[PDB]
Short mmCIF file of C-alpha atoms and ligand atoms in Angstrom, two decimals:
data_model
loop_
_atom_site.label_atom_id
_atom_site.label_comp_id
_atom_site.label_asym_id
_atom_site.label_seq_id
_atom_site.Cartn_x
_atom_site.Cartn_y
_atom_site.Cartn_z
CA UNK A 23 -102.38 152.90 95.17
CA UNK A 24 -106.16 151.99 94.46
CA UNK A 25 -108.74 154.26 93.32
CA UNK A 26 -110.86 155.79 95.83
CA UNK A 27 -108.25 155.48 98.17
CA UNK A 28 -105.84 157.72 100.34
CA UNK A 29 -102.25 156.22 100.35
CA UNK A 30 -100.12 157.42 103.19
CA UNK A 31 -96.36 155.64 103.70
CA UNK A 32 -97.69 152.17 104.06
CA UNK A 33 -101.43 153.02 105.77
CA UNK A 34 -103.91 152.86 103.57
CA UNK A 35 -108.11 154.48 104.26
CA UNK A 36 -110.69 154.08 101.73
CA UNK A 37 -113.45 155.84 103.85
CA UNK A 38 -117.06 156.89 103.41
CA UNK A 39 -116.73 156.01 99.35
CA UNK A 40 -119.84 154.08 99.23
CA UNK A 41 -117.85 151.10 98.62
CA UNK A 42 -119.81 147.35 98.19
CA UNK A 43 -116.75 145.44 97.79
CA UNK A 44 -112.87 145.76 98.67
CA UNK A 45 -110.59 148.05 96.83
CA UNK A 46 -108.48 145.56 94.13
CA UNK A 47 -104.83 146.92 93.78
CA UNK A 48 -104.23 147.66 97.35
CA UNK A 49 -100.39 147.47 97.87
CA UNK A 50 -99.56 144.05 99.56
CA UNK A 51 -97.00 146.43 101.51
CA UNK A 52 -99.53 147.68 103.72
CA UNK A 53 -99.70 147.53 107.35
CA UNK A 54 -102.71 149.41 108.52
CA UNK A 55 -106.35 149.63 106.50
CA UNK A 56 -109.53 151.33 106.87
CA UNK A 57 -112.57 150.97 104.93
CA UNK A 58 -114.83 152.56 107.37
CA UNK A 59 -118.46 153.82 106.65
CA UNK A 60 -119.04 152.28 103.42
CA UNK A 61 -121.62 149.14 102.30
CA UNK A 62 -119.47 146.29 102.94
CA UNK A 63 -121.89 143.20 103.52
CA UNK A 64 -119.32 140.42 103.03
CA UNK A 65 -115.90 139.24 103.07
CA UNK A 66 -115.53 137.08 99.89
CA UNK A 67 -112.99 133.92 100.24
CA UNK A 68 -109.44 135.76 99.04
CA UNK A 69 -110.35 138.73 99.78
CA UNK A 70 -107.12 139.53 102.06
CA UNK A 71 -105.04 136.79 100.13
CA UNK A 72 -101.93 139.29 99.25
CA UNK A 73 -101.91 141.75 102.80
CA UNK A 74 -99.95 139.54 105.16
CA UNK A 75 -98.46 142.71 106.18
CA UNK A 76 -101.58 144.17 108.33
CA UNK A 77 -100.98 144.41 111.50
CA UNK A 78 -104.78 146.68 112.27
CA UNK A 79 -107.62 146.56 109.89
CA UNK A 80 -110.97 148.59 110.94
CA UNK A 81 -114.81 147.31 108.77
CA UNK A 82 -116.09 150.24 110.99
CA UNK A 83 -119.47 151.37 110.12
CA UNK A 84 -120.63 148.95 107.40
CA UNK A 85 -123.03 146.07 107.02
CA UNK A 86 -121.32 142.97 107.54
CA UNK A 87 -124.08 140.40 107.91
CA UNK A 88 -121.78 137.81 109.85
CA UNK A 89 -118.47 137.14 111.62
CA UNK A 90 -117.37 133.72 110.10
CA UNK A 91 -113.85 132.50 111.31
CA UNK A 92 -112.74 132.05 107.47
CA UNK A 93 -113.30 135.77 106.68
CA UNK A 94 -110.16 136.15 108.53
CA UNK A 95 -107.93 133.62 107.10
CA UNK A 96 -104.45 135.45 106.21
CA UNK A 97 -105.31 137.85 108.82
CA UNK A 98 -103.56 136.07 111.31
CA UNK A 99 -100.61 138.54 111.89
CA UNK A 100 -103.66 141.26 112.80
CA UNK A 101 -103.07 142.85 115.85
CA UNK A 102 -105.99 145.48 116.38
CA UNK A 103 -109.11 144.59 114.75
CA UNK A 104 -112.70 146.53 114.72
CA UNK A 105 -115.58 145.59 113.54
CA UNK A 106 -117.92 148.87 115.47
CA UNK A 107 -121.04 149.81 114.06
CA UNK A 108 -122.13 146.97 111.54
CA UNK A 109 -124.99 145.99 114.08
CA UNK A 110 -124.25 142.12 113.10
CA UNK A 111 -126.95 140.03 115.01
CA UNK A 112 -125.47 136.50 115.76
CA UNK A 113 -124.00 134.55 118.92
CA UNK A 114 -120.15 134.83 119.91
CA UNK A 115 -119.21 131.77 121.60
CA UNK A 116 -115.34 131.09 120.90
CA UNK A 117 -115.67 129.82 116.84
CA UNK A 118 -115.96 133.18 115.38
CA UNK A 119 -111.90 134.05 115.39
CA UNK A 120 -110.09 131.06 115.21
CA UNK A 121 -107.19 132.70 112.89
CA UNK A 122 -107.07 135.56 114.64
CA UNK A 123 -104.08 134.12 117.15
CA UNK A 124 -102.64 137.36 117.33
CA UNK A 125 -104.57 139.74 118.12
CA UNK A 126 -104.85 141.87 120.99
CA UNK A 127 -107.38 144.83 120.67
CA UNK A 128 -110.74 143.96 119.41
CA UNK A 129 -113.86 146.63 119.41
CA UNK A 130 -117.41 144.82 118.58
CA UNK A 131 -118.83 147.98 119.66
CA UNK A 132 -122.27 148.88 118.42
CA UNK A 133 -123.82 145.90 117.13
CA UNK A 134 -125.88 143.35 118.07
CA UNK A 135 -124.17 140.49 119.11
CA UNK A 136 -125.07 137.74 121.67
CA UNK A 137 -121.98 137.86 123.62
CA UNK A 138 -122.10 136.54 127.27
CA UNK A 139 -121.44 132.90 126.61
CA UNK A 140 -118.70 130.87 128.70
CA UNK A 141 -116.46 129.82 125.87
CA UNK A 142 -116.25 133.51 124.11
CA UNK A 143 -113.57 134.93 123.47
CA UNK A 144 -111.43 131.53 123.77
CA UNK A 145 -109.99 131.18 120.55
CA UNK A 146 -108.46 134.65 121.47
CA UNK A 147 -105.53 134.22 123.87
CA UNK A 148 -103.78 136.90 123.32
CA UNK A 149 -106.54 139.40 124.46
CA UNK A 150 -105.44 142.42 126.25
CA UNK A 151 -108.07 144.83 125.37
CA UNK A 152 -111.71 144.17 124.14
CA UNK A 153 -115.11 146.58 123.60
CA UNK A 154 -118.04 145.13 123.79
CA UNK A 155 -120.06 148.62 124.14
CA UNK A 156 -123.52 149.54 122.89
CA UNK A 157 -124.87 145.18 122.39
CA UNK A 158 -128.03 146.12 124.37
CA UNK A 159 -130.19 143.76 122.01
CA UNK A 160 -128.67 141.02 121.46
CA UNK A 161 -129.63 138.57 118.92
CA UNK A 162 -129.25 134.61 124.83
CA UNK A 163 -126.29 133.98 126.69
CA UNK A 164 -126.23 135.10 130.52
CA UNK A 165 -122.99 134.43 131.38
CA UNK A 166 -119.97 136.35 132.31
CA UNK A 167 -117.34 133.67 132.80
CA UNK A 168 -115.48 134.20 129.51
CA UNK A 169 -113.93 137.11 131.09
CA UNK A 170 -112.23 135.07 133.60
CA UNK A 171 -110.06 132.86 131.10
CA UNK A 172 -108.91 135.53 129.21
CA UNK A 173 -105.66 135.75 131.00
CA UNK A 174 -103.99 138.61 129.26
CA UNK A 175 -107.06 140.88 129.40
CA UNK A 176 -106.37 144.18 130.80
CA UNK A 177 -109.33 146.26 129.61
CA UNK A 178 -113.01 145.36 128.88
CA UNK A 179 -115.76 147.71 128.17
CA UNK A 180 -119.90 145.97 128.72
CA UNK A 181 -120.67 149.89 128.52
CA UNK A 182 -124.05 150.63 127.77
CA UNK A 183 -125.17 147.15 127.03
CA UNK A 184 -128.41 146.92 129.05
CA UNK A 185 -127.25 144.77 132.01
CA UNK A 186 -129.64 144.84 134.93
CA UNK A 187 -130.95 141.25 135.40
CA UNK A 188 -130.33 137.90 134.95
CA UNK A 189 -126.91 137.31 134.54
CA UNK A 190 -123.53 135.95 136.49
CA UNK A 191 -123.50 137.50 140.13
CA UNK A 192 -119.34 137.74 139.90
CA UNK A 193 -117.27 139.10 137.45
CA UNK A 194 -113.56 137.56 137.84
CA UNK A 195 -110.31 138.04 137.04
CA UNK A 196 -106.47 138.70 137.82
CA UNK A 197 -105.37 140.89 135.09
CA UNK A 198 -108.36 143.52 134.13
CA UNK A 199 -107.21 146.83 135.20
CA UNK A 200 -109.38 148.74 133.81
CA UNK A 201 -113.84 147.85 133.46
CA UNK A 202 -116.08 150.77 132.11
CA UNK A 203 -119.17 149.52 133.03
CA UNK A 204 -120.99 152.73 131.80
CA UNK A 205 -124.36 153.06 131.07
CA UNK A 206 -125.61 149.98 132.43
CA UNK A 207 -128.14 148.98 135.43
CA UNK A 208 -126.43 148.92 138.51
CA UNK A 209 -128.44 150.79 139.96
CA UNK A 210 -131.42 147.81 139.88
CA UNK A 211 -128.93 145.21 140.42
CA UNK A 212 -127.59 146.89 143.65
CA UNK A 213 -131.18 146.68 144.80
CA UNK A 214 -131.54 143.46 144.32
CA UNK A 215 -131.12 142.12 147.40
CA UNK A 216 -127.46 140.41 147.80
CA UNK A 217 -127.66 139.09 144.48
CA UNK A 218 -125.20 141.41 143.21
CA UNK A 219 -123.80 142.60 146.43
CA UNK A 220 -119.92 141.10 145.25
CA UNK A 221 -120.20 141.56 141.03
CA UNK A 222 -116.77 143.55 141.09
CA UNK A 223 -114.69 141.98 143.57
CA UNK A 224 -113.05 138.94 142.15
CA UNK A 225 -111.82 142.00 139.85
CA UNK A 226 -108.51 141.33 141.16
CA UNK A 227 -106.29 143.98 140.72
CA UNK A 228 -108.37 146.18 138.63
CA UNK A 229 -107.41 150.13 138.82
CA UNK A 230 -110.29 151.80 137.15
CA UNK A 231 -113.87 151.17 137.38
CA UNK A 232 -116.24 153.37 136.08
CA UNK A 233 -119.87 153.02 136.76
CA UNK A 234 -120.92 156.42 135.68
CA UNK A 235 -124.93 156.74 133.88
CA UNK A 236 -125.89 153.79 135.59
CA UNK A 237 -129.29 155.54 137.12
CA UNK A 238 -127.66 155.08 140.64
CA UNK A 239 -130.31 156.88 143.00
CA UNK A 240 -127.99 155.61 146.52
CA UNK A 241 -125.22 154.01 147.19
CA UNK A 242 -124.98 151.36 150.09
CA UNK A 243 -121.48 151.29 151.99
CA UNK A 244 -121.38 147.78 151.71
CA UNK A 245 -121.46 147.37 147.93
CA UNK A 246 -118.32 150.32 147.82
CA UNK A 247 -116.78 148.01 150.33
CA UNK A 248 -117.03 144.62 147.93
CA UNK A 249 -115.40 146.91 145.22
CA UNK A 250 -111.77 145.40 145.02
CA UNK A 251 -109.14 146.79 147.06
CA UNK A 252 -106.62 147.94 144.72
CA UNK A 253 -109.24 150.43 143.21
CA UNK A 254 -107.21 153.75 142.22
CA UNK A 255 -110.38 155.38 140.30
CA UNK A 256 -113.95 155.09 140.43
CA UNK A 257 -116.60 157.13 138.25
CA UNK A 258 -119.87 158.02 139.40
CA UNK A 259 -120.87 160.60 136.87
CA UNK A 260 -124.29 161.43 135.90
CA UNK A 261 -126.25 159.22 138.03
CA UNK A 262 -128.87 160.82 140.46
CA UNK A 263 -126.88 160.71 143.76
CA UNK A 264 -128.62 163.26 146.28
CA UNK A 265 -126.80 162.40 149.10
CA UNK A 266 -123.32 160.81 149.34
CA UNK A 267 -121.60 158.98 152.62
CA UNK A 268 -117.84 160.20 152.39
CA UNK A 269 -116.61 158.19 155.62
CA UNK A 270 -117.49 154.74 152.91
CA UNK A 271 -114.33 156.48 151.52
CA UNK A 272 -112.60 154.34 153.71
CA UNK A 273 -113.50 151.24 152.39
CA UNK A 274 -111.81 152.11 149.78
CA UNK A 275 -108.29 152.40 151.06
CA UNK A 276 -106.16 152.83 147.47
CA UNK A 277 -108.82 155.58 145.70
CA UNK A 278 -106.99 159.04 144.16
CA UNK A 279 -109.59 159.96 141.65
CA UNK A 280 -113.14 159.92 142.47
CA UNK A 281 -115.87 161.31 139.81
CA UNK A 282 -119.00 162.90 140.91
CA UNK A 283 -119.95 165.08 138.93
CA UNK A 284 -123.40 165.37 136.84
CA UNK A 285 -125.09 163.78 139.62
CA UNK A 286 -127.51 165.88 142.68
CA UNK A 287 -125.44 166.59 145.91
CA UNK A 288 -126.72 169.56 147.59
CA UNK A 289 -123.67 170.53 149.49
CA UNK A 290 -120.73 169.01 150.24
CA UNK A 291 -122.41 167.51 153.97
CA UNK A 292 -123.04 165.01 155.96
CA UNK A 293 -119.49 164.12 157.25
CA UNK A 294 -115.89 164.89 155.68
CA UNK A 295 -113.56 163.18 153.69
CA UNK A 296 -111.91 160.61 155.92
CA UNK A 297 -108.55 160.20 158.23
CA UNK A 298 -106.51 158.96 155.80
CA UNK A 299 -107.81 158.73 152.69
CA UNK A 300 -105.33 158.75 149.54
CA UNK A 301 -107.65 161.48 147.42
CA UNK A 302 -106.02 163.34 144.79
CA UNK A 303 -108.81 164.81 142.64
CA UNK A 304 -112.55 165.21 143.52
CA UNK A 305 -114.60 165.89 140.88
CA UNK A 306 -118.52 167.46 142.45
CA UNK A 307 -118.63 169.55 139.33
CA UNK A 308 -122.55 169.94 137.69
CA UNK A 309 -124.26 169.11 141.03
CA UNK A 310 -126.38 171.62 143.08
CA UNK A 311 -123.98 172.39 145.98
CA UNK A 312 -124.83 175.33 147.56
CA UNK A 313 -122.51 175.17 150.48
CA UNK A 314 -119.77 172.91 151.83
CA UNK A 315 -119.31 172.22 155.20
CA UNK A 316 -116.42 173.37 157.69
CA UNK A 317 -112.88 171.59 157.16
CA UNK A 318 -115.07 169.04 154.81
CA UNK A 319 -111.81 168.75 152.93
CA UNK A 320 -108.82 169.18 155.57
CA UNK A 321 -107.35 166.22 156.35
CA UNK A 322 -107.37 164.83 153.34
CA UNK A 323 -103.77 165.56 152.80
CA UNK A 324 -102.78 164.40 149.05
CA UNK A 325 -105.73 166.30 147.29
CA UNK A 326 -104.04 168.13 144.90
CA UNK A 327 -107.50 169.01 142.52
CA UNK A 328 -110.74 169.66 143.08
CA UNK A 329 -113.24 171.35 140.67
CA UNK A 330 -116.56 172.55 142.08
CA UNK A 331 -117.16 174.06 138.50
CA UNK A 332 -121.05 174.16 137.42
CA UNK A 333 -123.14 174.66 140.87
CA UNK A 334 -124.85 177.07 142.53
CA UNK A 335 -122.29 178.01 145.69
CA UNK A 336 -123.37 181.37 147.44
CA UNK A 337 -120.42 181.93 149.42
CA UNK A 338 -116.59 180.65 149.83
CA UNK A 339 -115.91 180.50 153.61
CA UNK A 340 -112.30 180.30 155.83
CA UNK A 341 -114.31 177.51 157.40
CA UNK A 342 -113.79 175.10 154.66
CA UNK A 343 -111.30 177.01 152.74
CA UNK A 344 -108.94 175.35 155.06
CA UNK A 345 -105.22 174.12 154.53
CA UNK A 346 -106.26 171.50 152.25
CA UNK A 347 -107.64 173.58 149.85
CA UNK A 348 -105.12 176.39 150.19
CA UNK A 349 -102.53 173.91 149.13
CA UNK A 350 -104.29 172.44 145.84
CA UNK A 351 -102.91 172.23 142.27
CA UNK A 352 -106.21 173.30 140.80
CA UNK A 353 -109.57 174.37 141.95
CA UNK A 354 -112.29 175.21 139.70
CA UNK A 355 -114.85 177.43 141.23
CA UNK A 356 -115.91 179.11 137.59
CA UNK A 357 -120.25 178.90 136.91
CA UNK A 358 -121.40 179.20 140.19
CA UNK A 359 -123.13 182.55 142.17
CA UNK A 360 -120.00 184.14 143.75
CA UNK A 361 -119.86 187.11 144.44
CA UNK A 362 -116.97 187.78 146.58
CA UNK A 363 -114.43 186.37 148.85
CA UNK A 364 -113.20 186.91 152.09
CA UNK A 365 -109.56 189.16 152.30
CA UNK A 366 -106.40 187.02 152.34
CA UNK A 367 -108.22 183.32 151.72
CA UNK A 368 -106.29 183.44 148.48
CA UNK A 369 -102.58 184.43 149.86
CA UNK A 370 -100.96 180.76 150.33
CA UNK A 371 -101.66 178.98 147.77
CA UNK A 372 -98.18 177.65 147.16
CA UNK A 373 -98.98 174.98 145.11
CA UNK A 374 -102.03 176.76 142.73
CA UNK A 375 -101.40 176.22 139.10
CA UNK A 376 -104.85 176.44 137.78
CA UNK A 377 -107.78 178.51 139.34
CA UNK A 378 -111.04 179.38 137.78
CA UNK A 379 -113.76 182.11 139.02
CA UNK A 380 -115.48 182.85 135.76
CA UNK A 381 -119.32 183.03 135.50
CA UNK A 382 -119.86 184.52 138.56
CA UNK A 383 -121.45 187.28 139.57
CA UNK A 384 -118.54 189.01 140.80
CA UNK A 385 -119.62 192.34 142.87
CA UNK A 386 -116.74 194.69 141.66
CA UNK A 387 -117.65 198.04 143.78
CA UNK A 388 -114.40 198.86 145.71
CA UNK A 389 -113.81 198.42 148.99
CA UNK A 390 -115.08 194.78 148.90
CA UNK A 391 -113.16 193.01 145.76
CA UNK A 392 -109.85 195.42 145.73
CA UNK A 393 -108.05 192.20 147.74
CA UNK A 394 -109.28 189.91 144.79
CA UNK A 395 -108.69 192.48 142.06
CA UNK A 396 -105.17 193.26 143.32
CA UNK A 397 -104.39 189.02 143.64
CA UNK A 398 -106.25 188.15 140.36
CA UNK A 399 -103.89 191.13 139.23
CA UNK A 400 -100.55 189.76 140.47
CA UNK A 401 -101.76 186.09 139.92
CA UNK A 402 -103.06 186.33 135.91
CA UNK A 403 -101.06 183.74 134.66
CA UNK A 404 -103.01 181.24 137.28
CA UNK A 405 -106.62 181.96 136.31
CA UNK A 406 -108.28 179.94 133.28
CA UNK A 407 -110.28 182.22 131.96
CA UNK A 408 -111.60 185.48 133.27
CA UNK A 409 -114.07 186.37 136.26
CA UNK A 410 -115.65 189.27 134.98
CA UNK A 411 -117.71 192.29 137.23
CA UNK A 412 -121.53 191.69 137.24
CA UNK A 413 -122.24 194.81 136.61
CA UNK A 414 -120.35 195.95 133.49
CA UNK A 415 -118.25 192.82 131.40
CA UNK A 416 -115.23 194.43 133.13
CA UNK A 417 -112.41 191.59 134.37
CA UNK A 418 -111.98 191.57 137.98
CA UNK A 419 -108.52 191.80 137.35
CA UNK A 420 -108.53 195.23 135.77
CA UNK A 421 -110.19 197.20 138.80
CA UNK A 422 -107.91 199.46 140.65
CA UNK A 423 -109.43 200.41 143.74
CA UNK A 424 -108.38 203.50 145.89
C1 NAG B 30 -121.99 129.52 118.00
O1 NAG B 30 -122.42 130.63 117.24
C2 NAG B 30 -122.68 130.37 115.87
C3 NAG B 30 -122.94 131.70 115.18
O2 NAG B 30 -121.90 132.58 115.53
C4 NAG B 30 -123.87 129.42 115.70
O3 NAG B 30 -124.19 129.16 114.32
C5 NAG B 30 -123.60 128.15 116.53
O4 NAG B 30 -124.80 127.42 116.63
C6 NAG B 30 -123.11 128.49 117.96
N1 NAG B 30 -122.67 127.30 118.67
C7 NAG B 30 -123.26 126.89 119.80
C8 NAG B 30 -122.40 126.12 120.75
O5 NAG B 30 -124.45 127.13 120.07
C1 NAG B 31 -121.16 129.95 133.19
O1 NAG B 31 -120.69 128.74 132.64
C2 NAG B 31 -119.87 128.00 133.52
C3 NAG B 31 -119.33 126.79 132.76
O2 NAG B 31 -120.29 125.76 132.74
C4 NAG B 31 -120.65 127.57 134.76
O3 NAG B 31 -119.73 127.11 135.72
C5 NAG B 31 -121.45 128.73 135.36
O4 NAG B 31 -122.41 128.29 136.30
C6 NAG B 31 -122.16 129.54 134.28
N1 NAG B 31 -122.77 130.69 134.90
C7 NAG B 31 -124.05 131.03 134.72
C8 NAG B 31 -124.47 132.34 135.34
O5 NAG B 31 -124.86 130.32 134.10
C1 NAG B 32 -122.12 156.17 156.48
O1 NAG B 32 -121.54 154.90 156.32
C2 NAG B 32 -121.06 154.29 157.49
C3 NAG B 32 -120.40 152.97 157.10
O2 NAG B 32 -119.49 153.25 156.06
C4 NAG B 32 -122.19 154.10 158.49
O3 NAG B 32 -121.71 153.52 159.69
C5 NAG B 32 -122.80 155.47 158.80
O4 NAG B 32 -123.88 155.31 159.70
C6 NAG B 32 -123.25 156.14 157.51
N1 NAG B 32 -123.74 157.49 157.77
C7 NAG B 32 -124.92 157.93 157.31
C8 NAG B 32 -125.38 159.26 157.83
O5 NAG B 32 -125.62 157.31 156.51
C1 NAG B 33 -127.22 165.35 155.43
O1 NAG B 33 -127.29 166.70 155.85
C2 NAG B 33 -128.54 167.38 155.88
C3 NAG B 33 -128.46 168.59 156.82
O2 NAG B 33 -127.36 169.41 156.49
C4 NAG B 33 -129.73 166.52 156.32
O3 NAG B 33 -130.96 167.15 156.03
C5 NAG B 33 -129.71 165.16 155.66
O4 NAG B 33 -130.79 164.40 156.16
C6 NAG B 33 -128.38 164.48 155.94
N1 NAG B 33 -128.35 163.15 155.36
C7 NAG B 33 -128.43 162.03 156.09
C8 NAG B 33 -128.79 160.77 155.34
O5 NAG B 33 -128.22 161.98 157.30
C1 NAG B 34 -114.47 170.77 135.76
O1 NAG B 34 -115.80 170.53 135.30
C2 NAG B 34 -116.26 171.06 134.06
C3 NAG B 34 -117.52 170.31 133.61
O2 NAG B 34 -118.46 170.08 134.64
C4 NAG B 34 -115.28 170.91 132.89
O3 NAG B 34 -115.58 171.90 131.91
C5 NAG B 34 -113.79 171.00 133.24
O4 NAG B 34 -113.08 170.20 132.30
C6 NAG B 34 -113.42 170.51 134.65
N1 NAG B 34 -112.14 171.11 134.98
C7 NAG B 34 -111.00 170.42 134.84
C8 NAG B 34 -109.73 171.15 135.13
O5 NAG B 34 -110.96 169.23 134.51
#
C-alpha cells in the first residue's frame, strides 16, 4: 500500500493529497482507483503499466491539460471511467479513446470540451452510459449525430450545457432510455418556430426525459405530442410554468410520473387530468396553488401519489377530495395555509401510507378539529411529521375535545 493512500480489500483512493504525480507502489492487484481532487496535469507514458486489474479509475477534480488516446494504453480492461471537473478545453471527435474498448460508463462532466461532433464517441462501442454535463463553453461542433451510432447507449446527460441555438434539429436513437436534458434552453428552442418542434422524437424508446430548469415560460401541446411515445417520466421542475394544459396529458399515452414542481401554477385549473391517463405520481409541490378545482383528479384511476407540499392552499374541499384522492398511497399537503378540514374527508383512505399536514396553521379550538384530532390520533403511524395547533406548538394529534 502507497503512502498517502487508503487501501481497502483491493480499492484503492488517494484523495485530496495535493498530489502532482501518481502514487508509485500501488498494488498491481487493484481493481478500482481514485485520485480525485488533487494537481494531476498529466498522464506520463507507463504510468498504468502494472494495473491491468482496473476495472473503474476516477482523475476527478484535477488539471489534466488533455485527453490523448495513449494516456490510456493498459487501461483497456476499464469499465467506468471519469474524468469530471478537470475543465480540459479541446475537441472530442472519436480519436481521444481508442484503447478504451471496454468501457461502458464515462462522465466528462464539468469541463470544457468541444463535444458535438459526428464521429464522437466512435471509438467507444461499448457505451451504455455517458455524462456530458456542465460543457457550456466549449473550446465548435454543432452536431448531435454521434448519439445515434452509439448503439448500446442507454443514458446520456447534455445537462446544463448551454444548448439553445444552432445545433441538430433531431436527436436519434433506439436504445437511450433515459436523456436529462437539464438546465439547458428549451425554452428558446421551442420558440423557434418548427425548428425544434421534433428534437426528442426519434428518441425511440426512451423512458425518462427530464427537461427540468430549462426557463420554460409555456408549453405548446404540439411539442408534448412530438415527445416519443413510450415516455414513462417527464420532469418539468423549476421552470416558470404559470399555466399548464392537462388534457396535452393525452398525448402522452405511457406517462406515470410527471414533475412539476418549483415552477408557478396558481391552482390546479383549467381542465382535469384526462380519461385515461396512466398517472401514478404528480408532483405540483413549490408552486402557488391556492385552490384546485372540483374532481381535477378523479378519473385518473392509477394515481397512487401526489404531493401538493410547499404552496399556499386555503382550503381542502369534498369537491376535489374525490375518490381519487381518497384512495392514494401518499399525499403531501405539509407547508401550505390549512387550517382545517371538512368531517369524515379523511375516513377511506384504504390505501394511505404516507400523509403530511405539517406547517399549517392548524385552528385547534374544539368543536372544529376534534374529527382531525381524533383521526390524526388513531392514524399516527401514517403522518410524516407533525401538524401542530397555530396557536400554541401543541400536535393536532394530542387535543382531546369534549
Ligand atoms: C480531433 O481533436 C483533436 C484534439 O482532441 C485535434 O487535435 C484534431 O485536430 C481533431 N481532428 C479533427 C478531425 O478535426
Ligand atoms: C452531422 O453530420 C452528419 C454526417 O455528415 C450529417 O449527415 C449531418 O447533416 C450533420 N448535422 C449537422 C447539424 O450539421
Ligand atoms: C389544451 O390543449 C388542447 C390540445 O391538446 C387544445 O385543443 C385546447 O384548446 C387547449 N386548452 C387551452 C385552454 O389552452
Ligand atoms: C385558467 O383558469 C383561469 C380561471 O380560473 C383563467 O383566468 C385563465 O385564463 C385560464 N387559462 C386559460 C389559458 O384559459
Ligand atoms: C414533496 O415536495 C417537497 C419539496 O417541494 C419534498 O420535501 C418532498 O420530498 C416531497 N415529498 C415526497 C414524499 O417525495
Amino acid at each position: 500500500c502507497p503512502s498517502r493512500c487508503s487501501c481497502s480489500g483491493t480499492e484503492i483512493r488517494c484523495n485530496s493529497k495535493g498530489l502532482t504525480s501518481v502514487p508509485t507502489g500501488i498494488p498491481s492487484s487493484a481493481t478500482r482507483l481514485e485520485l480525485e481532487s488533487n494537481k494531476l496535469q498529466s498522464l506520463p507514458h507507463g504510468v498504468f503499466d502494472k494495473l491491468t486489474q482496473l476495472t473503474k479509475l476516477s482523475l476527478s477534480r484535477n488539471n489534466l491539460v488533455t485527453i490523448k488516446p495513449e494516456m490510456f494504453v493498459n487501461l483497456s480492461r476499464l469499465q467506468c471511467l471519469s474524468l469530471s471537473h478537470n475543465s480540459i478545453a479541446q475537441a472530442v471527435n472519436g480519436s481521444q479513446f481508442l484503447p478504451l474498448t471496454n468501457l461502458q460508463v464515462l462522465d466528462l462532466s464539468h469541463n470544457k470540451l468541444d463535444l458535438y461532433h459526428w464521429k464522437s464517441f466512435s471509438e467507444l462501442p461499448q457505451l451504455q452510459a455517458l455524462d456530458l454535463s456542465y460543457n457550456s463553453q466549449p473550446f465548435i461542433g454543432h452536431n448531435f449525430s454521434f448519439v445515434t451510432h452509439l448503439s448500446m447507449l442507454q443514458s446520456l446527460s447534455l445537462a446544463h450545457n448551454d444548448i439553445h441555438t444552432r445545433v441538430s434539429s433531431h436527436l436519434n436513437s433506439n436504445s437511450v432510455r433515459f436523456l436529462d436534458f437539464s438546465g439547458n434552453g428549451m425554452g428558446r428552442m421551442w420558440d423557434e418556430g418548427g425548428l425544434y418542434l421534433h428534437f426528442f422524437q426519434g428518441l425511440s424508446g426512451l423512458l425518462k426525459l427530464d427537461l427540468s430548469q430549462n426557463n420554460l415560460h409555456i408549453l405548446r401541446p404540439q411539442n408534448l405530442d412530438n415527445l416519443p411515445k413510450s415516455l414513462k417520466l417527464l420532469s418539468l421542475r423549476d421552470n416558470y410554468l404559470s399555466f399548464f394544459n392537462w388534457t396535452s396529458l393525452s398525448f402522452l399515452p405511457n406517462l406515470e410520473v410527471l414533475d412539476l414542481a418549483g415552477n408557478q401554477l396558481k391552482a390546479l385549473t383549467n381542465g382535469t387530468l384526462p380519461n385515461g391517463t396512466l398517472l401514478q405520481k404528480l408532483d405540483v409541490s413549490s408552486n402557488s396553488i391556492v385552490s384546485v378545482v372540483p374532481a381535477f383528479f378523479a378519473l385518473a384511476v392509477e394515481l397512487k401519489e401526489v404531493n401538493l407540499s410547499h404552496n399556499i392552499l386555503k382550503t381542502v374541499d369534498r369537491s376535489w377530495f374525490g375518490p381519487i384522492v381518497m384512495n392514494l398511497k401518499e399525499l403531501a399537503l405539509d407547508t401550505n395555509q390549512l387550517k382545517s378540514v371538512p368531517d369524515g374527508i379523511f375516513d377511506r383512505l384504504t390505501s394511505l401510507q404516507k400523509i403530511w399536514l405539517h406547517t399549517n396553521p392548524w385552528d385547534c379550538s374544539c368543536p372544529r378539529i376534534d374529527y382531525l384530532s381524533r383521526w390524526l390520533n388513531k392514524n399516527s403511524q401514517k403522518e410524516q411529521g407533525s401538524a401542530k395547533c397555530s396557536g400554541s406548538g401543541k400536535p393536532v394529534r394530542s387535543i382531546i375535545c369534549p
